[PDB]
Amino acid sequence: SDTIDLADGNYVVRRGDGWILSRQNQILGGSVISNGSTGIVGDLRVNDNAIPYYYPTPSFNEEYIKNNIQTVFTNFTEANQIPIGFEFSKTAPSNKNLYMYLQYTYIRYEIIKVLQHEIIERAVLYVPSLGYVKSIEFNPGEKINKDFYFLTNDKCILNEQFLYKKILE
Amino acid sequence: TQRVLPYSNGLYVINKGDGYIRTNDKDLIGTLLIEAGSSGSIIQPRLRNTTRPLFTTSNDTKFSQQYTEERLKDAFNVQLFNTSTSLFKFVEEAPSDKNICIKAYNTYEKYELIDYQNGSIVNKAEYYLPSLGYCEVTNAPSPESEVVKMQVAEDGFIQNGPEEEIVVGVIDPSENIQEINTAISDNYTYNIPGIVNNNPFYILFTVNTTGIYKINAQNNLPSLKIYEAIGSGNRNFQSGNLCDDDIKAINYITGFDSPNAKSYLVVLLNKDKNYYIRVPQTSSNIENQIQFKREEGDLRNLMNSSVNIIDNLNSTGAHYYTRQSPDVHDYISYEFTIPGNFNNKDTSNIRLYTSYNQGIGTLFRVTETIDGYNLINIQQNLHLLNNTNSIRLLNGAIYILKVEVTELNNYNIRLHIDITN
């Protein structure tokens, strides 16, 4: 639930790497390879595609979240100004068709207010990190599950973390 | 001989799949002839703030390219610039024996923006977002075999990617959004402000405790619609208060577009989710309120559906009522009062049936007690489509028929209440 074993106060939290956002699965397109061909897809995280997403709360506005997160954790305002590229490479089996689509992954940061061992307020920051592809073998006309294309709620493809530090007054 | 679309009135964005290419090789990147034992690759690199997409529209003034891009951003948060920074590359090594050919095509992702109103598409726009290509590999075509004369296949598109149709409703941008800053307890009354001034609008709100809620306007007028914000509540949270993620993508839950039908909504709402309530155009300056009441009684046996309030059931004979038919496995409710004086012994023979859409119906006797409304089942598994069966009901009593549509043959559902005796 929303109950945590922490003393009262404000905390900065790193939830880990590999967070993909809802409805943002095929925002970048995909490749269709077949019959032994190798498909390679890559991207470059610079500025406008490295925009961090803020979700503030009345206690924790943008400046608060940014300053706290950058003080304790990776400094993203200067890091996202440095272009980082990445690539994926899949190889389709013989006489079969494979579709691969790529989406951005993010770092999840949280600013939480804890009172009586329960979180009463939480603000969320997403910092662009890298990408991730999902691939499926398909035939012409085959129905494809809705879960492959569409993500309903933000989830972490990796192990979620909880790296917390108490915010000093 | 098309399909019936049970979409509520509004704006919808449809992801029709990936891997679309134009006919007559208009998107042909090219063909590489790799010798035996060698390797080959086709690379399609892209620049910054480039990559022209493909856009057509039925009404440029309303569905302009800027408008379509903003709606696409509302639905899936796509931006053309995102496709600019991408690269794709196809690598193929030919075997030792024979040569190999590889053909590369630039692909597109097909998005469609539709203005759905009363069972038809009044405005349609097609957007094609540059995708990450399509590659097909063949054995080396031995020159020459023959050359066979063929004709062009005219303008059109060919999808090489998997089948896909993801439909997402989006908030109408022209309609205002008012926020309820406080989470909803067991009871609340929203007074519609004069700022919007009779124009249809949305109410964004959340719920304190998960449960089944009755939402209605004054005298159940006008009919209200409810949507759920997709992916809401996973982000920034505050206990007992509303946190707007500015999510425009919505899922239609229930509601009637017809502003004159007396109706109230019974819906299961989640404290970890955000919801919108669309109230339509009101043609008067007369005040109105939205009432929110958490239900703990038998009314929870109506979720999730709009209950339609029938007033013209005051005589024997033929009566039928037309509403926007819900989708398959989606519910619609009717609350009606048999004509005559209620003396607990006078009965009238009632026939309930639908005209085109088949649905399974369950009717309830309603006896309002001092604890609230009490719903008593008196029949189950009623097949409404051309139902010839009749049941005797008490004159002056109140009944609620909940219908689950099991076959959609018409955009509208017609419930007939025939009264003899």
Coordinates of C-alpha atoms in Angstrom, one line a residue:
Chain A
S1 CA 0.0 0.0 0.0
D2 CA 1.1 3.6 0.7
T3 CA 2.5 2.6 4.1
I4 CA 6.3 2.7 4.5
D5 CA 8.7 2.1 7.4
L6 CA 10.2 5.6 7.5
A7 CA 10.2 8.4 10.0
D8 CA 8.2 11.6 9.3
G9 CA 9.7 14.0 6.8
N10 CA 10.5 14.6 3.1
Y11 CA 12.5 12.1 1.1
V12 CA 14.2 11.9 -2.3
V13 CA 13.8 8.5 -3.9
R14 CA 15.4 6.8 -6.9
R15 CA 13.1 4.0 -8.2
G16 CA 15.6 2.6 -10.8
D17 CA 16.1 2.4 -14.5
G18 CA 14.0 1.1 -17.3
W19 CA 10.7 3.0 -16.9
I20 CA 8.5 3.2 -20.0
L21 CA 5.5 5.5 -20.0
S22 CA 1.8 4.8 -20.9
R23 CA 0.5 5.2 -24.4
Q24 CA 4.1 6.0 -25.5
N25 CA 5.0 2.6 -26.9
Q26 CA 5.0 3.1 -30.7
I27 CA 5.7 6.8 -30.7
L28 CA 9.0 6.2 -32.6
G29 CA 8.0 3.5 -35.1
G30 CA 9.3 0.0 -35.8
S31 CA 11.0 -2.2 -38.3
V32 CA 9.7 -5.3 -40.1
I33 CA 12.4 -7.9 -41.0
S34 CA 12.0 -11.4 -42.4
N35 CA 13.8 -14.5 -43.6
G36 CA 17.3 -14.3 -41.9
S37 CA 17.8 -10.6 -42.4
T38 CA 19.1 -8.6 -39.4
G39 CA 17.3 -5.4 -38.5
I40 CA 19.2 -2.7 -36.5
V41 CA 17.5 0.4 -35.0
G42 CA 19.2 3.2 -33.1
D43 CA 18.6 6.6 -31.6
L44 CA 20.3 9.6 -30.1
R45 CA 19.2 11.3 -26.8
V46 CA 19.8 15.0 -27.2
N47 CA 17.8 17.9 -25.8
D48 CA 14.3 17.9 -27.3
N49 CA 14.1 14.2 -27.0
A50 CA 15.8 14.3 -23.6
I51 CA 13.1 16.6 -22.1
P52 CA 12.4 15.5 -18.4
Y53 CA 8.8 15.2 -17.3
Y54 CA 7.7 16.8 -14.1
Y55 CA 4.7 15.8 -12.0
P56 CA 4.8 18.2 -9.0
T57 CA 2.7 18.4 -5.9
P58 CA 1.7 21.5 -3.8
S59 CA 4.6 21.0 -1.4
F60 CA 7.1 20.0 -4.1
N61 CA 7.3 22.3 -7.1
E62 CA 9.6 21.9 -10.1
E63 CA 12.6 23.7 -8.5
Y64 CA 12.4 21.7 -5.3
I65 CA 12.4 18.3 -7.2
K66 CA 15.1 19.3 -9.6
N67 CA 17.5 20.7 -7.0
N68 CA 17.0 17.8 -4.5
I69 CA 17.3 15.1 -7.2
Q70 CA 20.4 16.6 -8.8
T71 CA 22.0 17.1 -5.4
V72 CA 21.6 13.5 -4.3
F73 CA 21.5 11.7 -7.6
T74 CA 22.7 12.0 -11.2
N75 CA 22.8 15.6 -12.5
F76 CA 20.5 15.4 -15.5
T77 CA 20.3 19.0 -16.6
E78 CA 24.0 18.9 -17.7
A79 CA 24.0 15.1 -18.6
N80 CA 21.1 15.4 -21.1
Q81 CA 23.0 18.1 -23.0
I82 CA 25.6 15.4 -24.0
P83 CA 24.4 13.2 -26.9
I84 CA 24.2 9.5 -26.1
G85 CA 23.4 7.0 -28.8
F86 CA 22.1 3.4 -28.6
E87 CA 21.3 0.5 -30.9
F88 CA 19.4 -2.8 -31.0
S89 CA 19.9 -5.7 -33.4
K90 CA 17.5 -8.5 -34.0
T91 CA 17.7 -11.4 -36.5
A92 CA 14.5 -13.0 -37.9
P93 CA 14.4 -16.7 -38.4
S94 CA 14.0 -18.2 -41.9
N95 CA 10.7 -17.8 -43.8
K96 CA 9.1 -15.9 -40.9
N97 CA 8.3 -12.2 -40.3
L98 CA 9.4 -10.2 -37.2
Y99 CA 8.2 -6.8 -36.1
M100 CA 10.2 -4.8 -33.6
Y101 CA 9.2 -1.4 -32.1
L102 CA 11.3 0.9 -29.9
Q103 CA 10.3 3.2 -27.0
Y104 CA 12.1 5.6 -24.6
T105 CA 13.0 4.4 -21.1
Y106 CA 13.2 6.7 -18.2
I107 CA 14.6 7.1 -14.6
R108 CA 11.9 7.5 -12.0
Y109 CA 12.5 9.9 -9.1
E110 CA 10.0 10.5 -6.3
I111 CA 9.7 13.2 -3.7
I112 CA 7.6 11.8 -0.8
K113 CA 6.2 13.3 2.4
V114 CA 6.0 10.6 5.1
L115 CA 3.7 11.0 8.2
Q116 CA 2.8 8.2 10.6
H117 CA 4.6 5.6 8.5
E118 CA 2.4 6.4 5.5
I119 CA 3.0 8.5 2.4
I120 CA 0.5 11.4 2.2
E121 CA 2.0 13.2 -0.8
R122 CA 4.3 12.1 -3.7
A123 CA 5.7 14.0 -6.7
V124 CA 7.2 12.1 -9.7
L125 CA 10.0 13.0 -12.1
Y126 CA 11.0 11.2 -15.3
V127 CA 14.5 11.7 -16.6
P128 CA 15.2 10.2 -20.2
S129 CA 17.8 7.5 -20.0
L130 CA 17.8 5.2 -23.1
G131 CA 15.4 3.0 -25.2
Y132 CA 14.0 -0.5 -25.3
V133 CA 12.5 -2.6 -28.1
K134 CA 9.8 -5.3 -28.2
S135 CA 9.7 -7.8 -31.0
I136 CA 7.1 -10.4 -32.2
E137 CA 7.0 -13.0 -34.9
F138 CA 3.8 -12.6 -37.0
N139 CA 2.0 -13.8 -40.1
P140 CA -0.2 -11.8 -42.5
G141 CA -3.6 -11.3 -40.9
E142 CA -2.7 -12.9 -37.5
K143 CA -4.4 -11.1 -34.6
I144 CA -1.9 -9.6 -32.2
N145 CA -2.5 -9.1 -28.5
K146 CA -3.4 -5.6 -27.4
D147 CA -0.8 -5.8 -24.6
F148 CA 2.1 -5.9 -27.1
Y149 CA 1.2 -2.6 -28.7
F150 CA -0.4 -0.6 -25.9
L151 CA 0.8 0.0 -22.3
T152 CA -2.0 1.1 -19.9
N153 CA 0.1 2.3 -16.9
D154 CA 3.7 3.3 -16.5
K155 CA 5.8 0.3 -15.5
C156 CA 9.5 -0.7 -15.1
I157 CA 11.0 -3.3 -17.5
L158 CA 13.7 -3.7 -14.9
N159 CA 13.8 -4.3 -11.1
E160 CA 12.2 -1.4 -9.3
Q161 CA 14.5 0.3 -6.8
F162 CA 13.9 2.4 -3.7
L163 CA 17.0 4.5 -2.9
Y164 CA 15.9 7.1 -0.3
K165 CA 17.5 10.0 1.5
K166 CA 15.9 12.4 4.0
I167 CA 15.6 16.0 2.9
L168 CA 17.1 18.5 5.3
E169 CA 15.2 21.6 6.3
Chain B
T1 CA -21.9 -4.1 -45.2
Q2 CA -19.5 -2.4 -42.7
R3 CA -19.2 -2.8 -39.0
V4 CA -21.2 -0.9 -36.3
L5 CA -19.1 1.5 -34.3
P6 CA -20.5 2.0 -30.8
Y7 CA -18.4 5.1 -30.1
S8 CA -19.8 7.9 -28.0
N9 CA -19.8 11.3 -29.7
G10 CA -16.3 12.9 -29.6
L11 CA -12.9 12.7 -31.1
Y12 CA -11.0 9.4 -31.5
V13 CA -7.4 8.6 -32.6
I14 CA -6.9 5.1 -34.1
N15 CA -3.5 3.4 -34.5
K16 CA -4.1 1.3 -37.6
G17 CA -0.7 -0.5 -37.4
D18 CA 2.8 -0.1 -38.6
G19 CA 4.8 -0.9 -41.7
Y20 CA 2.7 0.9 -44.3
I21 CA 4.3 1.7 -47.7
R22 CA 3.0 3.4 -50.8
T23 CA 2.2 1.4 -54.0
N24 CA 4.3 1.5 -57.1
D25 CA 7.5 1.5 -55.0
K26 CA 7.0 5.2 -54.1
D27 CA 8.8 4.5 -50.8
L28 CA 11.4 2.0 -52.2
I29 CA 14.7 2.8 -50.6
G30 CA 16.4 0.3 -53.0
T31 CA 17.8 -3.1 -53.8
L32 CA 21.2 -4.5 -53.0
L33 CA 22.7 -7.5 -54.9
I34 CA 25.1 -9.2 -52.4
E35 CA 27.5 -11.8 -53.9
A36 CA 27.9 -15.2 -52.3
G37 CA 29.9 -15.1 -49.1
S38 CA 29.9 -11.3 -48.9
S39 CA 27.8 -9.0 -46.8
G40 CA 25.5 -6.1 -47.5
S41 CA 23.6 -3.4 -45.6
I42 CA 21.1 -0.7 -46.3
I43 CA 21.1 2.3 -43.9
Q44 CA 18.5 5.0 -43.7
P45 CA 19.9 7.8 -41.6
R46 CA 17.9 10.9 -40.8
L47 CA 18.6 14.6 -40.0
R48 CA 17.3 16.9 -37.2
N49 CA 13.9 18.5 -37.4
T50 CA 13.0 16.9 -40.7
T51 CA 11.3 13.7 -42.0
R52 CA 8.2 15.0 -43.7
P53 CA 5.1 12.9 -42.8
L54 CA 2.0 12.1 -45.0
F55 CA -1.2 14.0 -44.2
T56 CA -4.7 14.1 -45.7
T57 CA -7.8 15.5 -44.3
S58 CA -11.5 15.8 -45.1
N59 CA -11.9 19.3 -43.6
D60 CA -8.7 21.4 -43.5
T61 CA -10.2 24.3 -41.5
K62 CA -11.1 22.0 -38.6
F63 CA -8.8 19.0 -39.0
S64 CA -5.6 20.9 -39.9
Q65 CA -2.2 19.3 -39.7
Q66 CA -1.4 21.2 -36.5
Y67 CA -4.8 20.1 -35.0
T68 CA -4.1 16.5 -36.0
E69 CA -0.6 16.6 -34.5
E70 CA -2.0 18.0 -31.2
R71 CA -4.6 15.3 -31.0
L72 CA -2.0 12.7 -31.7
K73 CA 0.1 14.1 -28.9
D74 CA -3.1 13.9 -26.7
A75 CA -3.6 10.3 -27.6
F76 CA -0.1 8.7 -27.6
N77 CA 2.2 11.7 -27.1
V78 CA 3.7 11.5 -30.6
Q79 CA 5.7 14.3 -32.1
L80 CA 7.2 14.5 -35.6
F81 CA 10.6 15.5 -34.2
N82 CA 10.8 12.2 -32.4
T83 CA 11.0 10.3 -35.7
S84 CA 13.8 12.7 -36.8
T85 CA 16.4 11.4 -34.4
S86 CA 15.9 7.7 -35.3
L87 CA 18.0 5.4 -37.5
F88 CA 17.4 2.0 -39.0
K89 CA 19.7 -0.4 -40.8
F90 CA 19.3 -3.8 -42.4
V91 CA 22.2 -6.2 -42.5
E92 CA 22.2 -9.4 -44.6
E93 CA 25.0 -11.9 -45.3
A94 CA 24.7 -14.0 -48.5
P95 CA 25.4 -17.7 -48.1
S96 CA 28.3 -19.5 -49.7
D97 CA 26.3 -21.0 -52.6
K98 CA 24.1 -18.4 -54.2
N99 CA 23.8 -14.6 -54.2
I100 CA 21.2 -12.6 -52.3
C101 CA 19.0 -9.6 -52.9
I102 CA 17.7 -7.2 -50.2
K103 CA 14.9 -4.6 -50.8
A104 CA 14.4 -1.8 -48.4
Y105 CA 11.3 0.4 -48.1
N106 CA 10.6 3.4 -45.9
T107 CA 7.5 2.7 -43.8
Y108 CA 4.9 4.7 -42.0
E109 CA 2.7 4.3 -38.9
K110 CA -1.0 5.0 -39.9
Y111 CA -2.9 7.2 -37.4
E112 CA -6.5 8.2 -38.0
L113 CA -8.4 11.1 -36.4
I114 CA -12.1 10.8 -36.5
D115 CA -15.0 13.0 -35.3
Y116 CA -17.6 10.5 -34.4
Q117 CA -21.1 11.9 -34.0
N118 CA -24.4 10.0 -33.7
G119 CA -23.1 6.8 -35.4
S120 CA -21.2 8.4 -38.3
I121 CA -17.8 9.9 -39.1
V122 CA -18.3 13.6 -39.9
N123 CA -14.6 14.5 -40.2
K124 CA -11.7 12.1 -41.0
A125 CA -8.0 12.8 -41.2
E126 CA -5.2 10.4 -42.1
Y127 CA -1.7 10.9 -40.7
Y128 CA 1.4 8.8 -41.6
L129 CA 4.3 9.1 -39.2
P130 CA 7.7 8.0 -40.6
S131 CA 8.5 4.6 -39.2
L132 CA 11.6 2.5 -39.1
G133 CA 11.4 0.7 -42.4
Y134 CA 10.6 -2.7 -44.0
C135 CA 13.1 -5.2 -45.5
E136 CA 12.5 -8.2 -47.7
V137 CA 15.2 -10.6 -48.8
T138 CA 15.1 -12.9 -51.8
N139 CA 17.4 -15.2 -53.8
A140 CA 19.2 -13.6 -56.7
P141 CA 16.8 -13.2 -59.6
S142 CA 18.6 -14.9 -62.4
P143 CA 18.7 -12.6 -65.5
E144 CA 16.5 -12.9 -67.2
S145 CA 13.9 -15.7 -67.1
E146 CA 11.5 -13.3 -68.9
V147 CA 10.1 -9.8 -68.6
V148 CA 6.4 -9.8 -68.0
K149 CA 4.3 -6.7 -68.8
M150 CA 2.3 -5.4 -65.8
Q151 CA 0.2 -2.3 -65.1
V152 CA 0.6 0.0 -62.2
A153 CA -1.6 -0.7 -59.1
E154 CA -2.9 2.9 -58.8
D155 CA -2.6 5.0 -55.6
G156 CA -2.8 3.2 -52.3
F157 CA -1.1 1.8 -49.2
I158 CA 0.2 -1.7 -48.3
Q159 CA 0.7 -2.7 -44.7
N160 CA 3.7 -5.1 -44.2
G161 CA 3.4 -4.9 -40.4
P162 CA 1.2 -6.9 -38.1
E163 CA -2.5 -6.1 -37.8
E164 CA -3.4 -3.4 -35.3
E165 CA -6.3 -1.1 -34.4
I166 CA -5.8 0.8 -31.1
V167 CA -8.7 3.2 -30.5
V168 CA -8.2 6.0 -27.9
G169 CA -10.7 8.8 -27.2
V170 CA -9.3 12.3 -26.7
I171 CA -10.6 15.4 -24.9
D172 CA -12.2 18.0 -27.1
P173 CA -9.8 20.9 -26.9
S174 CA -12.5 23.6 -27.5
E175 CA -14.5 22.4 -24.4
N176 CA -13.3 23.7 -21.0
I177 CA -12.1 21.5 -18.2
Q178 CA -13.1 22.4 -14.6
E179 CA -11.3 20.7 -11.7
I180 CA -12.6 19.5 -8.3
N181 CA -9.6 20.0 -6.2
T182 CA -10.9 17.9 -3.3
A183 CA -11.2 14.1 -3.4
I184 CA -14.8 12.9 -3.4
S185 CA -16.2 11.5 -0.2
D186 CA -19.6 9.7 0.2
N187 CA -21.4 12.9 -0.8
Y188 CA -20.8 16.1 -2.8
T189 CA -22.6 18.7 -4.8
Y190 CA -20.9 20.6 -7.7
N191 CA -22.6 23.9 -8.6
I192 CA -22.0 24.5 -12.3
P193 CA -20.2 27.8 -12.6
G194 CA -21.2 30.7 -14.8
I195 CA -17.8 31.0 -16.3
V196 CA -18.4 28.3 -18.9
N197 CA -21.8 29.7 -19.5
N198 CA -23.9 26.9 -20.9
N199 CA -21.3 25.4 -23.2
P200 CA -20.5 21.7 -22.8
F201 CA -17.5 21.0 -20.6
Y202 CA -15.6 18.4 -18.6
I203 CA -15.2 17.9 -14.9
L204 CA -11.9 16.4 -13.7
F205 CA -12.1 14.6 -10.4
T206 CA -10.9 11.7 -8.3
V207 CA -12.3 9.6 -5.5
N208 CA -11.4 9.1 -1.9
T209 CA -12.6 5.5 -1.4
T210 CA -13.0 2.9 -4.2
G211 CA -16.6 2.0 -4.8
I212 CA -19.8 2.3 -6.8
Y213 CA -21.2 5.8 -7.2
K214 CA -24.4 7.5 -8.5
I215 CA -23.8 10.7 -10.4
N216 CA -26.7 12.8 -11.7
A217 CA -27.8 16.3 -12.6
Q218 CA -30.8 18.1 -11.1
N219 CA -33.9 16.1 -12.0
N220 CA -31.4 13.8 -13.9
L221 CA -31.2 16.6 -16.5
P222 CA -29.2 16.8 -18.7
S223 CA -27.6 13.4 -19.4
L224 CA -24.0 13.1 -18.3
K225 CA -21.1 11.2 -19.7
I226 CA -18.1 9.8 -17.8
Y227 CA -14.6 8.9 -19.0
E228 CA -11.5 7.5 -17.3
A229 CA -8.1 9.1 -17.7
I230 CA -5.8 6.4 -19.1
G231 CA -2.7 5.8 -17.0
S232 CA -3.8 8.3 -14.4
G233 CA -2.9 7.9 -10.7
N234 CA 0.4 6.1 -11.2
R235 CA 2.2 9.4 -11.1
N236 CA 2.2 12.3 -8.5
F237 CA -0.1 11.6 -5.6
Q238 CA -1.6 13.5 -2.7
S239 CA -4.0 11.9 -0.2
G240 CA -7.5 13.3 -0.4
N241 CA -6.8 15.7 -3.2
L242 CA -6.6 15.8 -7.0
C243 CA -3.4 15.6 -9.0
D244 CA -3.8 16.5 -12.7
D245 CA -1.4 14.8 -15.0
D246 CA -2.9 16.7 -17.9
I247 CA -3.9 13.4 -19.5
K248 CA -6.2 14.0 -22.5
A249 CA -6.5 10.4 -23.5
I250 CA -9.8 9.0 -22.1
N251 CA -11.9 5.8 -22.2
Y252 CA -15.6 6.1 -22.5
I253 CA -17.4 4.3 -19.6
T254 CA -21.0 5.3 -20.0
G255 CA -23.3 8.2 -20.7
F256 CA -25.9 9.4 -23.3
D257 CA -25.1 12.1 -25.8
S258 CA -28.8 13.0 -26.0
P259 CA -29.1 16.0 -23.6
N260 CA -32.8 15.5 -23.1
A261 CA -32.9 11.9 -21.8
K262 CA -33.5 11.8 -18.1
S263 CA -30.6 9.6 -16.8
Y264 CA -28.3 9.0 -13.9
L265 CA -24.9 7.2 -14.0
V266 CA -24.0 4.2 -11.8
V267 CA -20.2 3.6 -12.1
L268 CA -17.5 1.8 -10.2
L269 CA -14.7 4.4 -9.5
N270 CA -11.2 3.9 -8.3
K271 CA -9.4 6.1 -5.8
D272 CA -6.1 5.6 -7.7
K273 CA -7.7 6.9 -11.0
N274 CA -8.8 10.2 -12.5
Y275 CA -12.2 10.7 -14.2
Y276 CA -13.8 13.2 -16.5
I277 CA -17.5 14.1 -16.6
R278 CA -18.8 15.6 -19.8
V279 CA -21.9 17.7 -19.4
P280 CA -23.4 18.8 -22.8
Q281 CA -24.7 22.1 -24.1
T282 CA -27.5 23.5 -21.9
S283 CA -29.8 25.8 -23.8
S284 CA -30.9 27.8 -20.8
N285 CA -29.5 30.1 -18.1
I286 CA -31.2 28.0 -15.4
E287 CA -28.9 26.8 -12.6
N288 CA -28.0 23.1 -12.3
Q289 CA -25.9 20.9 -10.0
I290 CA -24.0 17.6 -10.3
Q291 CA -24.7 15.4 -7.4
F292 CA -22.2 12.6 -6.4
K293 CA -23.5 10.0 -3.9
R294 CA -21.6 6.8 -2.9
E295 CA -24.0 3.9 -2.9
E296 CA -23.9 1.1 -0.4
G297 CA -27.3 -0.5 -1.1
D298 CA -28.8 -2.5 -4.0
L299 CA -28.1 0.3 -6.6
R300 CA -24.6 -1.2 -6.9
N301 CA -26.5 -3.8 -9.0
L302 CA -26.5 -1.3 -11.9
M303 CA -22.7 -0.7 -12.6
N304 CA -21.6 0.4 -14.9
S305 CA -24.5 2.0 -16.8
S306 CA -26.7 5.0 -17.3
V307 CA -30.3 4.5 -16.1
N308 CA -32.9 6.1 -18.3
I309 CA -35.9 7.8 -16.6
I310 CA -39.2 7.3 -18.5
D311 CA -42.0 9.7 -18.0
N312 CA -44.5 9.1 -20.8
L313 CA -45.5 5.6 -19.5
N314 CA -49.0 6.8 -18.4
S315 CA -51.3 4.7 -20.6
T316 CA -51.8 1.3 -22.0
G317 CA -50.6 0.5 -25.5
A318 CA -47.3 0.7 -27.4
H319 CA -44.2 2.6 -26.2
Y320 CA -40.6 2.3 -27.5
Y321 CA -37.5 4.3 -26.7
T322 CA -34.4 4.8 -28.7
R323 CA -30.9 5.3 -27.1
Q324 CA -27.3 5.0 -28.2
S325 CA -26.7 1.3 -28.0
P326 CA -23.7 0.3 -25.7
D327 CA -21.0 -1.9 -27.0
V328 CA -21.0 -5.7 -26.5
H329 CA -21.0 -6.7 -22.8
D330 CA -21.9 -3.1 -21.9
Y331 CA -25.0 -2.2 -19.9
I332 CA -27.9 0.2 -20.3
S333 CA -30.7 0.7 -17.7
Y334 CA -34.3 1.9 -17.9
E335 CA -36.3 3.0 -14.9
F336 CA -40.1 3.1 -15.6
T337 CA -43.4 3.4 -13.7
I338 CA -46.4 1.4 -14.9
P339 CA -49.5 3.6 -15.4
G340 CA -52.4 3.3 -12.9
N341 CA -53.0 3.7 -9.2
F342 CA -50.8 1.6 -6.9
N343 CA -53.1 -0.5 -4.7
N344 CA -50.7 -3.5 -4.5
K345 CA -53.2 -5.8 -6.3
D346 CA -53.9 -4.2 -9.7
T347 CA -51.7 -5.7 -12.4
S348 CA -51.0 -4.9 -16.1
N349 CA -49.4 -7.4 -18.5
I350 CA -46.1 -6.0 -19.7
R351 CA -44.1 -7.0 -22.8
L352 CA -40.4 -5.9 -22.9
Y353 CA -38.4 -6.4 -26.1
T354 CA -35.7 -4.9 -28.3
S355 CA -36.0 -4.4 -32.1
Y356 CA -32.5 -5.0 -33.6
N357 CA -29.9 -5.5 -30.9
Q358 CA -30.0 -8.7 -28.9
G359 CA -29.5 -8.2 -25.2
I360 CA -29.9 -10.2 -21.9
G361 CA -32.1 -8.3 -19.5
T362 CA -32.7 -8.4 -15.8
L363 CA -35.5 -6.3 -14.3
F364 CA -35.8 -5.3 -10.6
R365 CA -38.7 -4.2 -8.5
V366 CA -37.8 -0.9 -6.8
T367 CA -39.2 -0.3 -3.3
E368 CA -37.7 2.8 -1.8
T369 CA -37.2 2.2 2.0
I370 CA -36.1 4.5 4.8
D371 CA -32.6 3.1 4.2
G372 CA -32.6 4.0 0.5
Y373 CA -33.6 2.1 -2.6
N374 CA -34.1 -1.7 -2.5
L375 CA -33.8 -3.7 -5.7
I376 CA -35.5 -7.1 -5.8
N377 CA -34.8 -9.5 -8.7
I378 CA -38.0 -10.9 -10.3
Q379 CA -36.6 -12.4 -13.6
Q380 CA -33.2 -13.2 -15.1
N381 CA -31.8 -14.3 -18.5
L382 CA -34.4 -12.4 -20.6
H383 CA -33.6 -12.4 -24.3
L384 CA -35.0 -9.0 -25.4
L385 CA -34.6 -9.4 -29.2
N386 CA -38.2 -9.9 -30.5
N387 CA -39.3 -11.3 -27.1
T388 CA -42.9 -12.6 -27.2
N389 CA -43.0 -13.5 -23.5
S390 CA -44.9 -11.2 -21.1
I391 CA -45.0 -10.7 -17.4
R392 CA -47.7 -9.1 -15.1
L393 CA -46.4 -6.1 -13.2
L394 CA -48.1 -4.1 -10.4
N395 CA -49.7 -0.8 -11.5
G396 CA -48.0 2.2 -10.1
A397 CA -44.9 0.3 -9.1
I398 CA -41.3 1.2 -10.2
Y399 CA -39.0 -1.1 -12.2
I400 CA -35.5 -1.0 -13.5
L401 CA -34.5 -3.1 -16.5
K402 CA -30.7 -3.6 -16.9
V403 CA -29.8 -4.8 -20.4
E404 CA -26.5 -6.2 -21.5
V405 CA -26.0 -6.0 -25.2
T406 CA -24.7 -9.4 -26.5
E407 CA -25.0 -8.6 -30.2
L408 CA -24.6 -5.2 -31.8
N409 CA -26.6 -4.9 -35.1
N410 CA -27.5 -1.2 -34.8
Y411 CA -25.9 1.9 -33.5
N412 CA -29.2 2.5 -31.5
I413 CA -31.0 0.2 -29.1
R414 CA -34.8 0.4 -29.0
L415 CA -36.6 -0.8 -25.9
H416 CA -40.3 -1.4 -26.4
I417 CA -42.7 -1.5 -23.4
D418 CA -46.0 -2.8 -24.6
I419 CA -48.9 -2.5 -22.0
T420 CA -52.2 -4.3 -22.2
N421 CA -55.1 -4.5 -19.8

